[PDB]
Structures are given as C-alpha cells and as structure tokens.
Design a protein around this nucleic acid. Structure first.
Lengths: 92, 87
DNA sequence: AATACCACTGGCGGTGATAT
DNA sequence: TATATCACCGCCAGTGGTAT
C-alpha cells in the first residue's frame, strides 16, 4: 500500500552487499544487530530492516554503517557513494 | 518552527539568491525546475518554512554557483563527514 | 511579474512485540 | 540468544491552487 514503498532492485542488492559484510565481520569486530542499532541510535528492528532490504539506506545511514563496519560505502553501495561524492563537489 | 541556526541558514541562502539572480537569469520557478521541484517548494526553503537537507543544499549551491558553506556551514560539515566514508 | 500563503498528503524512517 | 518479520504510524517536505 501507500505507507511503505518497495526498494528498487538496486537498493536490494546494496542491502545484500551490506548484510554480507556484516556477517563476515561481526566476529572480528565484536558486533550484534543490537550493538549496531545502539551505535546508530535506533532499535534492532530498524537495523534489521536495513540489512534485510525492507527500508532503504540514505546517505547518512550508509556513511554511519560504513564507519561502524570499517569499509567504505562503495563496497556495498556504489550508487550512494557517488551521490555522496557529488554532494561533496558542492562544498569543496 | 525551524531552529534559529536553520533560520539563519535560510536567510543567508535567500540573500545569495537575491544578489545573483539577475546575473544568473534565475527566478524561484527556474531554480525549482532545475531541482525537480515546484516554485512553492523552493519558496518554502528560501523563506525558512521547510528545513534544508544535504542533497537540496548541494543542488542549490551548484545552481547559485557558490559553496554550501556560504549559506550553511553546518550542512557543509555534514557533507564532509559522509565523504569521509567514501574518501 | 514574481512571490508568498494555505490546507493538505505520500511515504521516509522508524517502533515494539512476536516468530524462527 | 540472535535475527527476521509483522502490524503499525508520526511527521514534515513538497504539493497545486490561490492571493498579493
């Protein structure tokens, strides 16, 4: 319905990429979805939604997660990385 | 209402538009066309009615030929921090 | 003319509980 | 325990129509 909009195919692949990085690294980083949520100031279901392709990433959340997982945003979402780069061109 | 800093940002932004409009041949509708939105929406931003976010601020900066920091140092800072994650 | 004003609404960005 | 999923929705940025 009207309340929530489904993600594009591209947003879906971005989420699969993100969740795989999280799985590969949650051990070495000592993470949990609940700790990630805390770091971001949301609950486990908010993070679960991003990881599972229910809610889409925005530039801000993507940047935060990249930092938490210690990767660059482009390793999961090249398109958001590029939107972030184009915004940067307006500051620099 | 928006915060005092958000209101200042809007005042800086409109001042810039007022000053460069003639040389750049702009109007609130043409700037709106350029951002994919309507005159009403643009007017709300210029007038401190709706808050600016990083994307719209970056578009506006490019349309006005200025840097984001010229109207909103706080947003410029946010932008830079996201970039720290793409680097 | 160009801009400002008004009432309104889709969908972003979540929540807590429950199921696995 | 950790995660995945479910029902649910506040809020406001942007709207189109109109007034100045």
């Amino acid at each position: 319905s009207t309340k929530k909009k489904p993600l594009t195919q591209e947003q879906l692949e971005d989420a699969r990429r993100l969740k795989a990085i999280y799985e590969k690294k949650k051990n070495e980083l000592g993470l949990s979805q609940e700790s990630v949520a805390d770091k971001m100031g949301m609950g486990q279901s908010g993070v679960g939604a991003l990881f599972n392709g229910i809610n889409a990433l925005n530039a801000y959340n993507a940047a935060l997660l990249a930092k938490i997982l210690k990767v660059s945003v482009e390793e999961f979402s090249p398109s958001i990385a590029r939107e972030i780069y184009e915004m940067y061109e307006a500051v620099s």
